[PDB]
């Protein structure tokens, strides 16, 4: 069967595993270029795609900060609501 | 869970009957225009010339919907396996 529910792994672990997968997919391209006997410029033209994918995974990982623990976040956990414990105004803090 | 794709070839035709069944409903609207022109000229013969363009216009429009319905029935068969 199937179910609509929560994500299995945390965001940080998900991004970590994605970065590892792109590292593998880039290492394979690099090993293949080395087996073919390509130079630096040809290796660049070969594996620039996987390099950019790895860099984007790294950007996502660096961009995601795990949340800090405090009384407001714990109360939001108890209330089971998506809540930002860094805003005095909510949706208007985006414009204020 | 398990996943069974099924391709029912018989369904190439079951819809064609329904599409064919809906071609005859506009025919009443088709004849409703000529009937209207008939009764209109039967109440005012002199106006028969000025309402004939409306009569031809309405026949085509009512007929077109039946004709539009027909496209699905003919498109359902001669290309789909």
């Amino acid at each position: 069967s199937s179910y609509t529910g929560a994500a299995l792994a945390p965001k940080s672990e998900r991004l970590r595993l994605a970065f590892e997968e792109k590292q593998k997919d880039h290492q394979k391209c690099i090993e293949e270029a080395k087996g073919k006997g390509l130079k630096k410029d040809e290796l660049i033209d070969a594996c620039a795609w996987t390099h950019r994918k790895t860099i984007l995974a790294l950007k996502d990982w660096f961009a995601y900060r795990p949340p800090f623990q405090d009384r407001r976040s714990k109360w939001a956990e108890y209330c089971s609501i998506r809540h930002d414990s860094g805003s005095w105004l909510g949706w208007s803090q985006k414009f204020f | 869970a398990i996943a069974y794709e099924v391709t029912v070839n018989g369904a190439n035709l079951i819809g064609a009957g329904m599409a064919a069944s809906g071609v005859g409903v506009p025919a009443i609207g088709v004849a409703m225009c000529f009937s209207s022109y008939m009764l209109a000229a039967a109440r005012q013969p002199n106006m028969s010339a000025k309402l004939l363009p409306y009569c031809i216009l309405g026949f085509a429009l009512s007929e077109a919907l039946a004709l539009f319905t027909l496209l699905i029935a003919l498109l359902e068969l001669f290309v789909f396996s």
Partner: protein
């Protein structure tokens, strides 16, 4: 073809724009303008050119979300897991027996 008449393939090229580089050069141009003009902090120039950027950055660094957005961390479709009883366990044991 009718879809061929309902199609627009009159494109010429793809304009590629590094909005990150453009944002960097915009900020650099703002800094260069403010330095050349030697403008103070109370100027409307300085206010318009600095305050909204600082406000949005401060908000994006102050944000401490207990949970990520809706379609990124939950409400996701997941295949049902194998149970430790009944038929799933029997299939697991049969798999272990066949493999070994």
């Amino acid at each position: 073809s009718p879809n061929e008449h309902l199609m627009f393939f009159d494109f010429s090229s793809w304009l590629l724009v590094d909005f990150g580089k453009r944002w960097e050069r915009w900020v650099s141009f703002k800094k260069s303008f403010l330095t050349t003009t030697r403008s103070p902090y109370w100027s409307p120039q300085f206010f318009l050119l600095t305050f909204f950027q600082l406000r949005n950055s401060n908000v994006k660094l102050c944000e401490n979300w207990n949970w990520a957005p809706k379609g990124d961390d939950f409400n996701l479709l997941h295949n049902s897991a194998a149970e430790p009883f009944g038929r799933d366990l029997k299939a697991h044991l049969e798999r272990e027996a066949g493999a070994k």
